[PDB]
Structure 1
Amino acid sequence: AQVINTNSLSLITQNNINKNQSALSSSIERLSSGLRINSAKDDAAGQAI
């Protein structure tokens, strides 16, 4: 082995999971309610219109 103090590969995996986290949360949150905008983290101009 080469790295024993730090699991940088684990850090990479955790970053990938964290990146997927936002997509999963947004998808399920938008699925729960009818509105696509949902308190617009999304496009603001469409929300105003």
Structure 2
Amino acid sequence: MAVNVNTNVAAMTAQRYLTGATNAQQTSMERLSSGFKINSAKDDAAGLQISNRL
């Protein structure tokens, strides 16, 4: 990609990464607020099942 105005791939990359850091921030803050490492099934399914059984 040469010099142009209609497109900006760097802007896409940056925001893609930013949103990645944002989801990381949100999950870390959720874990800190709840005090639990597995609050739902998407964290660890087997871990969630074994913790529920315990």
TM-score normalised to structure 1 length: 0.81
User: Which residue of the partner structure matches residue 40 of structure 1?
Assistant: 41
Identical pairs, percent: 49
Q: CA deviation at 1:26?
A: 0.5
2:20 equivalent to 1:19 = yes
- Render the CA deviation track for 1:18-47: whole Å, top value 9, x for unaligned: 111211110001110122111232111111
Displaced runs of 4 or more, over 2 A: none
What do you get for the CA RMSD once the two structures are aligned? 1.5
Unmatched runs of 5 consecutive residues or more in structure 1: none
How many residues get paired?
A: 49
Q: Write the letter of the residue equivalent to 2:33.
A: S
Q: What's the TM-score, normalizing by structure 2?
A: 0.76
Taking the aligned partners of 2:39 and 2:12, their CA distance within structure 1 comes to: 32
